[PDB]
Symmetry: C3
Subunit: 288 residues, 3 copies
């Protein structure tokens, strides 16, 4: 059901039951899965594939003519004027280089979002499944985003930011290049995050500081009573050991591994590993 005014290149691969509104353009090397719907004045460019039942709202632009690809899974909604799979802003990007973007399934990318392709041919911007990305979010070159995350309006993820699963960022969060955000984390409104946020934790305010565990999120995500009790105890041992082993972060981490009562709990072990990862090569440490 392609409106007569639309410009659909004869070599575009158009699935069954695809609907294309007036004044859309679809390029020669685009593949649209069955049931896709393009609202009026939406656009797909370049070497680009959408899975079944994706929706482009008015003004949405997916793909660009730069070498490489934009690959998107099924049941994604691309909001009004969202720009998804375009050239990165990295000055080190070399003209004519292939660049890549991969998006999974069941994501909602809201109005005015910008999601950029990778900065080099060996790398890729990656978004998983079931993410809600609210209006005016920016996802820079080479970000790696997992599943079931919620990014509120105006969340800015700079280059090479890594986000795991089930995280929440509140409005106008700014995440510095190369920072990692562990699963179930919470970033408070207007936070400027310049170091890693470990698994299960929350950061907030100005140049953001660690503020404890994301207990509300843990509760909402089916963590048991004693799971959260163990995590709080482990948190206390690591960060709030005010009287013992002065000027030693790793020694407190060590004492947690040895503490068989806490370390045998899977979430505690995962949290401890999350923390140690922040001090491995190139990684930026953790928020203060």
């Amino acid at each position: 059901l392609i409106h007569p005014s639309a410009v659909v290149h004869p070599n575009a691969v158009i699935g069954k039951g695809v609907s294309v509104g007036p004044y859309c353009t679809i390029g020669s090397s685009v593949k649209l899965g069955n049931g896709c719907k393009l609202y009026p004045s939406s656009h797909v460019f370049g070497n680009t594939e959408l899975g079944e039942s994706c929706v482009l709202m008015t003004g949405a632009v997916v793909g660009d003519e730069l070498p490489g690809y934009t690959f998107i899974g099924c049941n994604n909604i691309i909001g009004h004027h969202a720009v998804v799979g375009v050239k990165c802003q990295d000055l080190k990007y070399k003209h004519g280089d292939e660049c890549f973007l991969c998006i999974g399934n069941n994501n909602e990318i809201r109005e005015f979002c910008s999601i950029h392709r990778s900065s080099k041919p060996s790398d890729k911007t990656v978004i998983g499944d079931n993410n809600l990305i609210m209006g005016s979010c920016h996802i820079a070159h080479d970000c790696k985003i997992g599943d079931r995350n919620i990014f509120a309006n105006n969340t800015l993820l700079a280059g090479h930011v890594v986000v795991e699963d089930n995280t929440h960022t509140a409005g106008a969060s700014v995440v510095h290049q190369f920072c990692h955000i562990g699963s179930f984390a919470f970033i408070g409104g207007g936070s400027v995050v310049s170091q890693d946020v470990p698994k299960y934790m929350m950061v907030a305010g100005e140049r953001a500081e660690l503020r404890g565990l994301n207990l509300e999120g843990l509760r909402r995500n089916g963590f048991t009573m004693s799971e959260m009790k163990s995590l709080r105890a482990a948190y206390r041992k690591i960060f709030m050991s005010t009287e013992t082993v002065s000027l030693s972060f790793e020694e407190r981490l060590t004492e947690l591994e040895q503490d068989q009562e806490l370390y045998s709990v899977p979430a505690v072990s995962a949290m401890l590993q999350s923390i140690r990862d922040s001090f491995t090569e190139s990684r930026r440490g953790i928020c203060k």
Copy 2:
């Protein structure tokens, strides 16, 4: 004066002297008042009414096909690529529910703004008259905005935010869900407002703090010499009573009511009532 390229559904209700530029689309259930003007590539969808002499700039999208309505008064200007009356971002929104947006008269909504419909059929996103809403502002589901407000670029109003009259928000303000902003208030640049801002007051900086009265705004809005003198005295009694009645906020509020000299002034009484409202059921208290 409808350009031949435009797609105007035969059942759209088009007033006298309406101008429609090339590549616009106007849906079947749209009503445009006399003198409306749609610039090239602007769009009206869904059950949507614009009053007389509204202007849509290029790329502007008003309404969407979701049940319910977008109802807009007269002499509104909708900026380039602004998206007004679209589905909310609330995860509790139920598929197929009616949702509502009501905008009054003489507003200016600038480029890249996003104004969302309500999250439930019993509720509504409401904007009054004579508001200036600058570029890239976000107005979430269920907000209630009064008259004569000025929201600078990138102001984010989260769900159920209530703004009264003649307020100013500076650039990149973030207002937390359910917060109230009283008349003549000022929110400083980049403020993260997580509690109410009472009538006549100003908040600023990081996780925002109360900083006094909005004296510049009061002066600009024809408040008399002794009006402002009374308000400053009332402010001092409430917030800066450093030596008396320790650990008691309500007792100081009580002492202001009893102070006949100050309380008989209409603005003082309004300010005191504004403060008390912040501690009634569900309300979030006031900024520190």
Copy 3:
């Protein structure tokens, strides 16, 4: 190479080798230099000139029908849905007044940027050469921007902001009206800048504070070993003179002029002059 669907006014001045995609509009008083390229659904309005080899991405809007002009140099790239040369947001702007925007050469203006015309006919919004302006930046009426600057996503420059050369602003910076940003300066993420940032210096965090010299930028821009050593010494004398001449800023500035060893260095002299300029008529002082 003008697509048959495009609306190109017969009086538009179209250079050699200009490419115009489907659903573009080009107004009667537009001049496009040789080699310009308009992607699908891009728009040029009003009294507007683009130099040779400019590129408009999909949704880009350049110019508006307000009196005055939008004048843009050669080899500029205007990103998706960027809005460049439109009416300012200043309430003092008088209906029917001429307003002006001038942009130089080799700039990159990314998606969703908004660049506004001047607030009065005697003034102008000015952008120089080789600037990178990332997604969703706002450049208000009457700004004066130099050359080789980098503004990260969501940088907001309010009215009459002046930026010199080779500056960097990190994501979500907010610069208050009338503030000046000297050459080689760095503004940290989410900074709310309410006073001037002198030449060579860096500001960061919340309501932003001065934090020292932008040493990384100085190093990157070919400043010599002893140049930077002299600047650091001059910085120390001015700002970190903890024991001498209490409650006197100008007396320390004076002592630097008299210090022939430091003041004879060109960068030191330029820095000192940059600082003094912030205390001349109307200017806002410097960040604390």
